[PDB]
DNA sequence: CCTACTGTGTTTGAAAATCCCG
RNA sequence: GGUGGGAGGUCUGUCCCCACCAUGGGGUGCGCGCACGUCCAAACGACCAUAUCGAUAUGUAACCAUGCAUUGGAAAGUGCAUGGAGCAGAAGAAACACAGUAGG
DNA sequence: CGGGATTTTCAAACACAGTAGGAGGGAAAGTTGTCCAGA
């Protein structure tokens, strides 16, 4: 009867929605600014070849940044010496294994700059933190003593982060998680029984609009042998009698299963496309950025500011009061622009959330029933070759669906067998597999097979063929 | 001529040592 | 009753709440009314008021309770400090980096 | 003065440049009206 079954999972990440009083929000975004300034100062000093940061020079004369030299007190005290808006970041948010320099800078230099030394690697191809990409995280380590739920309710918390005061009110526990060895304890029971970690990672990430999400991540730090260092369970509902399932996707659909059920892609992109164009041409004529009529004003004022500063500093000698240096301001987007920007951002977030929840529901439904997933591909680049699906999958991001199927097939260990998109899936039949080249075109919906078939739906036939192929390759290993 | 979703890969703390306002 | 919406982590409907479109026409039936299923006309991220060239700006909304200062003789609000926020059915793994891409 | 809170150490430094020819359905453009969009 689709009952909930507790399953041990590797590394959970609770997704909540904090409610920080204005002071707490101010402290959080000041910490985001502190992390971005540490990022910028470090990676702008690596290109000046500062001996404090650069690692051991090699015998060839090359100079690399070594990340162990980059996470000591002396560096942070130099940083606070330069500017006072840099110590507000948590110390554990910068130096720890899951902080700003062994988790973000490491991957960034390993991927963007191809792991090349600072003397050879180029600068203008590396993306820093600025108004385009501010720092949307910081991963402190807290004790469960700072994670206090509420018992009058059954979904609310009380989280007080380091360096901040007020016990920020979380919301929405995933209470279907269970602690202890057999998953029979609530959070308070395991906190009192001492079967939980001490320093927990909360990766406080703010979304595009002000929405101070928190991620109280769990883990199994050491799983030496088979027992993890920590144990907890999570319950999801699985069909009483699962069967192998093959999935198909159509232009007018979002998913079709071999059982017969068909799911409709609401496809919100065109649904709100009229209002989308409304607000697009709205902000395209506003008085701030993303305008093409106020950027030029901002560039002009910045250029004249720098030119006058250069022509007043050296030629004027800055003795006591030479000339009259005026700076004014770089101008800001207007409130009327601001309200419409925030409303439109809420709208793209609304389609994002609607689509995300819809795919979450679809994946949750299929994953429990599917004892053996038989989807074709694990990537979208094999679905865009014919250009027919691209027009729909551009609006419906199917790679997120791929990822959701991937990690919801893993928590039950549901296999996900993938095969190449080259077989005569359309030509073959569900009964005898007779090859008919006329079916290749998508427009055919009903085609009576000459021998013993009627084939009123291609989607069922294709899913049947894919499932049969997946079974056959299991029967004889390739 | 500038903003913004996305496709893809990777990753997910414990423990001595030092500090700070009742 | 529909139109779009705001809070209850997210979605569907209701709950509470924000600004609008109709009181219409009609295909077929029953005895001027009722309409068996429809469809159209709407309302679409506010509406107002202001000034200066539809649209640019500005004062601006979407749950309940407590306390504080304020507007208030009031009735009820403003700001601040908090707290509380369902119901029926669904789900509830996130963060980082790279770039192309689409929009105007 | 003192007991929990923050905070350094484990613990570990360096990727990118290569080379074509393999498969198929999706596809019209380009009007002056009414109003539209900024004007």
A419 lies in a domain? no
A96 lies in a domain? yes
State the nucleotide closest to A277 in CA–C1' terms. C104
A152/A106 same-domain check: no
A143/A234 same-domain check: yes
Range of the domain at A74: 23-111
Q: Is A44 helix (H, G, I), strand (E, B) or coil?
A: helix
Q: What is the resolution of this structure in A?
A: 3.6
Give dist(CA A411, CA A423) in Å, integer. 30
Q: Is A182 helix (H, G, I), strand (E, B) or coil?
A: coil
Q: Is A318 helix (H, G, I), strand (E, B) or coil?
A: coil
Give dist(CA A442, CA A471) in Å, integer. 26
Q: Which of A460, A459, A478, A363 is nearest to A420 (CA)?
A: A478
Give dist(CA A376, CA A378) in Å, integer. 7
Total domains in chain A come to 2
A458 lies in a domain? no
State the nucleotide closest to A355 in CA–C1' terms. C11
DSSP one-letter string for A335-402: HHHHHHHHHHHHHHHHHHHHHHHHHHHHHHHHHHHEEEE--S-S-STTTSSSSTTHHHHTTS-HHHHH
Q: How was this structure determined?
A: cryo-EM
Assess contact for A89 and A137: CB atoms under 8 A: no
Give dist(CA A375, CA A463) in Å, integer. 8
> How far apart, in Å, are the Cα atoms of A363 and each of A210, A311, A326?
29, 64, 60
In the DSSP assignment, the letter for residue A263 is E
In the DSSP assignment, the letter for residue A153 is S
A407 lies in a domain? no
A151/A228 same-domain check: yes
Give dist(CA A79, CA A94) in Å, integer. 12
A79/A105 same-domain check: yes
- Integer-rounded Cα Rg, in Å, for chain A is 28
- Kindly report the bases of strand D lying within 7 A of a protein C-beta atom: 5-16, 24-27, 37-39
A126 lies in a domain? no
> Within 10 Å of residue A214's Cβ, how many Cβ atoms?
23
Give dist(CA A404, CA A401) in Å, integer. 5
Instruction: Using the structure block, give the residue that is written with the tokens 């892609």.
Output: A265
Assess contact for A436 and A447: CB atoms under 8 A: yes
Strand partners, A238: A3
Instruction: Using the structure block, give the residue that is written with the tokens 């402190």.
Output: A140
> How far apart, in Å, are the Cα atoms of A478 and each of A415, A459, A472?
17, 26, 10
In the DSSP assignment, the letter for residue A58 is P
Q: What share of chain A is helix, strand, coil (3-state, %, to 5)?
A: 35, 10, 55
In the DSSP assignment, the letter for residue A19 is B
State the nucleotide closest to A393 in CA–C1' terms. B6
Give dist(CA A161, CA A142) in Å, integer. 7
Q: Which of A38, A215, A50 is nearest to A139 (CA)?
A: A215
User: Looking only at Cα atoms, what is the longest distance across chain A?
Assistant: 100
Assess contact for A94 and A78: CB atoms under 8 A: no
Q: Which residues of A40-77 are buried (b: 16+ CB within 10 A; e: fewer)?
A: ebbbebbeeeeeebbbeeeeeeebbbeeeebbeeebbe
Assess contact for A392 and A251: CB atoms under 8 A: yes
A37/A107 same-domain check: yes
Rounded, the Å distance between the CA of A313 and C1' of C96 is: 42
A12/A143 same-domain check: yes
Give dist(CA A16, CA A251) in Å, integer. 35
A405 lies in a domain? no
A11/A50 same-domain check: no
Among candidate residues A219, A238, A257, the one where a domain is terminated: A238
A170 lies in a domain? yes
Give dist(CA A435, CA A449) in Å, integer. 10
Give dist(CA A43, CA A125) in Å, integer. 13
Give dist(CA A390, CA A136) in Å, integer. 31
A175/A93 same-domain check: no
Give dist(CA A401, CA A390) in Å, integer. 15
Assess contact for A65 and A115: CB atoms under 8 A: no
Among candidate residues A216, A238, A260, the one where a domain is terminated: A238
- Kindly report the bases of strand C lying within 7 A of a protein C-beta atom: 5-6, 8-12, 44-46, 55-60, 80-86, 90-99, 101-104
A9/A37 same-domain check: no
A152/A233 same-domain check: yes
- Kindly report the bases of strand B lying within 7 A of a protein C-beta atom: 1-15
Q: Where are the alpha helices (DSSP H) in A83-127?
A: 91-95, 105-111
A227 lies in a domain? yes
Rounded, the Å distance between the CA of A24 and C1' of D6 is: 19
Calculate helix-pair angle for A335-369, A398-408, nearest 10 degrees. Answer: 40
A76/A149 same-domain check: no
Assess contact for A157 and A148: CB atoms under 8 A: yes
Long-range contacts of A277-285 (CB under 8 A, 24+ apart): A279/A340, A279/A343, A279/A344, A279/A347, A282/A340, A282/A344, A283/A337, A283/A340, A283/A341, A283/A344
């Amino acid at each position: 009867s689709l009952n909930a079954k507790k399953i041990r999972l590797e590394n959970y990440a609770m997704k909540m929605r904090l409610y920080p009083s204005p002071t707490q929000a101010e402290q959080m975004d000041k910490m985001f600014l502190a992390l971005r300034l540490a990022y910028n100062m470090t990676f702008h000093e690596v290109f000046q070849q500062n001996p404090a940061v650069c690692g051991d020079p090699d015998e060839d004369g090359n100079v690399w940044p070594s990340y162990k030299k980059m996470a000591n007190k002396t560096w942070r005290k130099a940083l606070i010496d330069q500017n006072p808006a840099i110590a507000e970041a948590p110390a554990a948010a910068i130096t720890t294994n899951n902080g700003l320099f062994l988790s973000n800078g490491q991957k960034a230099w390993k991927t963007g700059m191809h792991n090349l030394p600072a003397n050879k690697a180029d600068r203008k191809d590396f993306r820093f933190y600025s108004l385009s990409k501010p720092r949307r995280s910081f991963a402190v380590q807290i004790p469960p003593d700072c994670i206090i739920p509420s018992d009058t309710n059954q979904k609310v918390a009380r989280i007080k982060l380091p360096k901040i005061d007020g016990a920020i009110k979380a919301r929405g526990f995933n209470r279907k998680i269970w602690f202890g060895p057999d998953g029979k304890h609530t959070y308070e029971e395991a906190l009192a029984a001492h079967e939980l970690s001490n320093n927990l990672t909360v990766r406080v990430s703010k979304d595009t609009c002000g929405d101070y999400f928190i991620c109280i991540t769990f883990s199994q730090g050491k799983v030496k042998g088979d027992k993890p260092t920590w144990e907890f369970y999570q319950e999801v509902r699985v069909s009483p009698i699962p069967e192998p399932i093959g999935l198909d996707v159509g232009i007018k659909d979002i998913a079709i299963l071999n059982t017969g059920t068909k799911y409709e892609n609401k496809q919100f992109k065109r649904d709100r496309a009229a209002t989308l164009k409304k607000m697009s041409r709205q902000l395209s004529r506003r008085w701030g950025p993303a305008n093409s009529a106020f950027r030029d004003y901002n560039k002009n004022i910045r250029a004249e500011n720098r030119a006058l500063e250069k022509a007043q500093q050296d030629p004027g000698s800055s003795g006591v009061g030479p000339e009259a240096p005026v700076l004014k301001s770089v101008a800001q987007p207007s409130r009327r622009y601001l309200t419409i920007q925030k409303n439109r951002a809420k709208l793209e977030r609304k389609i994002a959330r609607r689509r995300d929840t819809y795919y979450h529901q679809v994946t949750a439904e299929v994953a429990g029933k599917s004892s053996l997933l038989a989807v074709e591909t694990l990537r979208v680049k094999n679905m865009l070759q014919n250009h027919r699906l691209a027009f729909a999958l551009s609006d419906a991001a199917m790679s997120d669906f791929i990822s959701k199927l991937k990690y919801k097939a893993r928590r039950i260990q549901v296999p996900l067998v993938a095969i190449g998109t080259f077989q005569p899936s359309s030509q073959t039949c569900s009964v005898c597999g007779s090859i008919n080249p006329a079916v290749k075109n998508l427009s055919i919906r009903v085609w009576t097979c000459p021998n013993c078939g009627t084939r009123h739906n291609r989607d069922i036939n294709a899913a049947k063929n894919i499932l049969a192929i997946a079974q056959n390759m299991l029967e004889k290993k390739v």
